[PDB]
Each structure stands twice: as C-alpha cells, then as structure tokens.
Amino acid sequence: TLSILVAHDLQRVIGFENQLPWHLPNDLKHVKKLSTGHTLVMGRKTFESIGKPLPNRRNVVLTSDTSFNVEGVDVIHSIEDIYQLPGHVFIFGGQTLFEEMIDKVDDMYITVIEGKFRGDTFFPPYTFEDWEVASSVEGKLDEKNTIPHTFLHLIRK
Numbered sequence: 001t002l003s004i005l006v007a008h009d010l011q012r013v014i015g016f017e018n019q020l021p022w023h024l025p026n027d028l029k030h031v032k033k034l035s036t037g038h039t040l041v042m043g044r045k046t047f048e049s050i051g052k053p054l055p056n057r058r059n060v061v062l063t064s065d066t067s068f069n070v071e072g073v074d075v076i077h078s079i080e081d082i083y084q085l086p087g088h089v090f091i092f093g094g095q096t097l098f099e100e101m102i103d104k105v106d107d108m109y110i111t112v113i114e115g116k117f118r119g120d121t122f123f124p125p126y127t128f129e130d131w132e133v134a135s136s137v138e139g140k141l142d143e144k145n146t147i148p149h150t151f152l153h154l155i156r157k
C-alpha cells in the first residue's frame with residue numbers, strides 16, 4: 001500500500017530553507033508511530049535536511065546523483081522504482097515527490113498545522129471531492145506543543 005505522509009499549514013506550506021517551519025514534537029511522534037517498521041521514499045533535499053537515515057525502517061532516497069551511496073540508505077533514480085518496493089511505503093517528501101505522487105497514492109496521512117507560516121515549499125492543492133476523511137483527530141496541545149494541529153487520514157474515493 002502506497003501512502004503520503006506530510007505536515008502542511010493552512011496555506012499548504014511544508015518547508016522553509018530546507019527545514020520544517022514549525023517546532024512540533026507531537027507531529028514527529030506521529031510520524032515515528034506511523035512509519036516505524038515500514039519504508040520511506042524521500043527526495044534528496046529532504047534526506048540531507050534530516051541528515052541521517054531514520055531508524056527502524058527502510059530509507060529510500062530518490063536522486064539523479066549516481067555517486068549517492070549512503071550508509072543505511074537505498075537509492076533509486078526513477079519514480080518508476082517506487083513501485084517495486086515491498087510492503088507499506090510512505091512518500092515522505094518534500095515538494096517535488098508530493099507533486100509527482102499525489103495522483104498515484106492510496107491514501108494520505110496529513111497533519112494540518114493550523115497556522116500561517118512563511119514557506120518556500122508547498123503541498124499540492126487537493127479537494128475533498130476526491131478524498132474521503134477516514135479520520136480526523138485534533139492534536140493535544142501543551143507548552144512544548146503549542147500550535148493547533150489535526151491529524152487527517154484521507155482515502156482516495
């Protein structure tokens with residue numbers, strides 16, 4: 001099963017200067033919970049931002065770079081390769097993978113971050129005409145998690 005995993009704000013911002021625009025530990029716990037034991041496919045800039053492969057899942061990086069051979073990362077050089085990956089595969093970002101994949105995935109796990117951040121990278125527009133809300137769960141706030149957010153799971157109609 002092929003899924004998107006993304007956090008985006010009220011205007012679909014995902015990213016600023018190759019980093020997440022917000023500090024939201026609870027989103028990152030959500031990401032850990034969902035993707036542990038599965039596979040992640042991310043483009044090269046997302047990989048560099050994170051800087052290491054994430055533990056306890058297959059990390060797959062998409063890059064035209066044929067010298068890319070990183071310890072604990074599988075490399076693919078085409079979108080077409082994503083389909084040969086076994087198991088539950090999460091399209092992990094960033095902008096350019098989302099744009100390529102949004103029409104192809106079974107479902108999306110979206111954290112809607114309920115604020116308006118400066119961004120330089122966006123998730124593509126989508127409509128609920130196309131996507132059934134399987135679930136919608138308000139994120140709990142505390143002093144360390146102070147931005148309202150909602151976890152959506154959307155299934156393509």
Ligand SMILES: NC(=O)C1=CN([C@@H]2O[C@H](COP(=O)(O)OP(=O)(O)OC[C@H]3O[C@@H](n4cnc5c(N)ncnc54)[C@H](OP(=O)(O)O)[C@@H]3O)[C@@H](O)[C@H]2O)C=CC1
Binds near residue numbers: 005014015062
């Ligand atoms: N909020 C969220 O949920 C998430 C946010 N982000 C954010 O997104 C931003 C980065 O996004 P973006 O700039 O689009 O970059 P990406 O992370 O998507 O990666 C860009 C690169 O991916 C590689 N790539 C993508 N498509 C292909 C292809 N078909 N063939 C070969 N290589 C390909 C290329 O690498 P090369 O040039 O090396 O060939 C390309 O330059 C960051 O700010 C980051 O913080 C990222 C993930 C999630």
Ligand SMILES: COc1cc(Cc2cnc(N)nc2N)cc(OC)c1OC
Binds near residue numbers: 007019020054091111
């Ligand atoms: C695990 O830490 C990171 C995760 C992500 C991707 C990501 C983050 N949040 C959500 N909801 N979905 C995603 N695909 C992107 C990151 O930086 C660009 C990360 O470093 C902080």
